[PDB]
């Protein structure tokens, strides 16, 4: 993993030692180069994992996530350099440094062979994320958003730290491989019930679970565009990845401990999809849609089937790409009208035709239109849930109906109808914005040709 | 602010005639029943006091609501018609011409010269029409959404730009 980690670390000296006007060029070029290198991790094995050293390993679950992170960094850089054009050289370098630090922490988080190292790296992601949100966000609400995000995450994470050190003291190891191979069944007792809750709640609040999600609208809305991109695309997936890793020590306690969480997510996907139907803030609507897809991921991980895990992996990848695309599309309109209100700028298809096409593609992917990998993940999870209990088809069908309704409603209200009469500053789409959408959408569709690359290690 | 009694009687006359036309369809039948309807409206044409005239209007409106055609004929481009607001997707605002690339504009030199002439007109006349609006609007602000004509030679009616330069009904 050092052939990936060290180039990323080298982004910092290069960023700080480059000319004031070569900052974005250099960072973009070499982050794309690092993303090219990360693709070689997709050469996986059927049975074993890629166990490089004692401290880093890679399997079919973490390799697509690593590729997604390394890909997100350059797109972040293209999205940021517009609203940060008037900033000072040192402050731009600090923003780039925060993004690089976040990518480095995420890369080591997804490959950490030990549970406590994973914990520290997954907690380290808070610091640059919080800095981005609170320093470079636009509104006075960014401070409260930062506090919510920080303290929700930490209230989740500290009991996990206690549980992890207890597990290390009783089992002798926190090594992922050892944990799998020396797996003990978890008995039915209050001690084990609370150990389960401690092992699960941090990833629950990270995803987030419905009812523990109130930080996410604040944080994903108040953050600058790159912050929203990472928060929606890679940071939510830390909960799903960690839950997939740690559920191997929670059986058979997960059989009945998951019932409250299964109920919460199955109903809260309905609840948050309905909320999207009435959201007056475009960025808030996009933030609220992440909760439903992540609720589907929660159900898939909690029912513990090969098909459910495959669907959850594919859904995490597809949601990362699609949610980041939607945030970028909303940000392009925000940078023109300086507002997130959705009915402010209507009838945009007759002013920005290719951007309207990008909007249609993003809405279609959020719709989970087949054969997109969004649909593959959603359908696999739906089938596994149907096996788990047939009655799950009522709620999941309702959810896909409501998802269609709000996705197409957003498309219609922003792109269609009559343009607003007094808004006379909708300049033509820049090459940079169109390239941002294209680099969001093209790899999403190419994955349909090789879907096994994102179906996880249970494929 | 409000509709007078005469206005309301006329609106009901027009609406009832149109729904009668939707019911009758054929032109001779519509002519016959339209003359009968006009006789109904002419029966109380000269009514002394407006209390019973208004009661007649109320009864006529209740009758109209009972007997209206569920789907009356609608002119295609009128609200609720089948061609209503069909051409909004082509009505590009005129400020988009400024954001054209200089190579798009060079294909239309004469048009953009005329457009610069209109823009110079608008820029020049703007101050003396805000002035006229101030000099004509009584204290407390406007009471009606009406606007004045230009009153002296050389001036343009205030707030004329977006009325005069509005998109055509069949733009693209």
């Amino acid at each position: 993993m050092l052939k990936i980690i060290i180039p990323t670390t080298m982004l910092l000296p290069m960023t700080w030692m480059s000319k004031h006007n070569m900052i974005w060029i250099n960072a973009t070029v070499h982050s794309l180069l690092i993303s090219l290198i990360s693709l070689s991790l997709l050469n996986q094995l059927g049975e074993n994992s890629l166990n490089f050293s004692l401290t880093f390993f890679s399997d079919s679950l973490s390799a697509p996530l690593l590729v997604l992170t390394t890909w997100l960094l350059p797109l972040m850089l293209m999205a940021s350099q517009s609203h940060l054009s008037k900033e000072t050289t040192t402050r731009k370098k600090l923003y780039i440094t925060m993004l690089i630090l976040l990518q480095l922490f995420l890369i080591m988080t997804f490959t950490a062979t030990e549970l406590i190292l994973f914990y520290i790296l997954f907690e380290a992601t808070l610091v640059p994320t919080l800095i981005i949100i609170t320093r470079w966000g636009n509104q006075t609400e960014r401070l409260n958003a930062g506090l919510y995000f920080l303290f929700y995450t930490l209230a989740g994470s500290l009991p996990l730290l206690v549980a992890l050190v207890y597990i290390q003291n009783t089992t002798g190891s926190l090594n992922f491989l050892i944990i799998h191979y020396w797996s003990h069944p978890l008995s039915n007792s209050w001690s084990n019930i609370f150990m389960w809750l401690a092992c699960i709640m941090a990833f629950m609040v990270k995803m987030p679970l419905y009812g523990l999600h109130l930080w996410l609208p604040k944080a994903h809305v108040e953050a600058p565009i790159a912050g929203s991109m990472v928060l929606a695309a890679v940071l939510l997936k830390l909960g799903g990845y960690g839950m997939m890793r740690i559920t191997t020590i929670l059986n058979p306690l997960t059989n009945y401990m998951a019932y409250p969480f299964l109920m919460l997510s199955m109903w809260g996907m309905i609840m948050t999809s309905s909320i999207c139907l009435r959201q007056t803030d475009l960025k808030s609507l996009i933030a609220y849609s992440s909760v439903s897809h992540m609720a589907l991921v929660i159900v898939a991980i909690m029912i513990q089937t090969p098909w459910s895990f495959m669907g959850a992996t594919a859904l995490m990848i597809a949601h990362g790409l699609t949610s980041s695309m939607l945030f970028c599309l909303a940000n392009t309109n925000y940078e023109r009208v300086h507002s997130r209100t959705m009915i402010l700028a209507r009838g945009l298809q007759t002013l920005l035709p290719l951007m309207a096409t990008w909007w249609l593609m993003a809405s279609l992917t959020n719709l989970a239109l087949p054969p997109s990998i969004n649909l593959i993940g959603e359908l696999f999870i739906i089938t596994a849930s149907f096996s788990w209990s047939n009655i799950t088809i009522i709620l999941m069908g309702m959810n896909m109906m409501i998802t269609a309704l709000y996705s197409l409603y957003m498309l219609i209200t922003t792109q269609r109808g009559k343009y607003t009469h007094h808004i006379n500053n909708i300049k033509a789409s820049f090459t940079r914005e169109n390239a941002l959408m294209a680099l969001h959408i093209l790899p999403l569709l190419l994955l349909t040709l090789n879907p096994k690359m994102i179906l996880g290690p249970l494929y | 602010a409000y509709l007078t009694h005469q206005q309301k009687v006329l609106r009901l006359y027009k609406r009832a005639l149109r729904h009668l036309e939707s019911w009758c369809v054929h032109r001779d039948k519509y002519r016959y029943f339209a003359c009968l309807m006009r006789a109904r409206f002419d029966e109380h044409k000269n009514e002394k006091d407006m209390v019973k005239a208004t009661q007649l209007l109320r009864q006529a409106e209740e009758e109209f609501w009972y007997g209206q055609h569920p789907q009356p004929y609608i002119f295609p481009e009128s609200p609720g018609g089948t061609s209503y607001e069909r051409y909004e997707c082509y009505k590009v605002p005129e400020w988009c011409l400024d954001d054209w690339h200089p190579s798009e504009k060079a294909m239309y030199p004469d048009y953009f010269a005329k457009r610069e002439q209109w823009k110079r007109l608008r820029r020049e006349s703007w101050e003396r029409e805000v002035k006229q609006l101030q000099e004509e609007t009584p204290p407390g602000g406007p009471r009606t959404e009406a606007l004045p004509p230009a009153r002296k030679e050389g001036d343009l009616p205030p707030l004329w730009w977006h009325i005069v330069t509005r998109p055509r009904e069949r733009p693209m």
Binding site: L351, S429 | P93, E94, C96, H101, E104, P167, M172
Partner: peptide, 12 residues
């Protein structure tokens, strides 16, 4: 008769 059609910039 040909009229000028107003459209957004298609250049970019």
């Amino acid at each position: 008769k040909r009229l000028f059609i107003i459209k957004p910039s298609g250049f970019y």
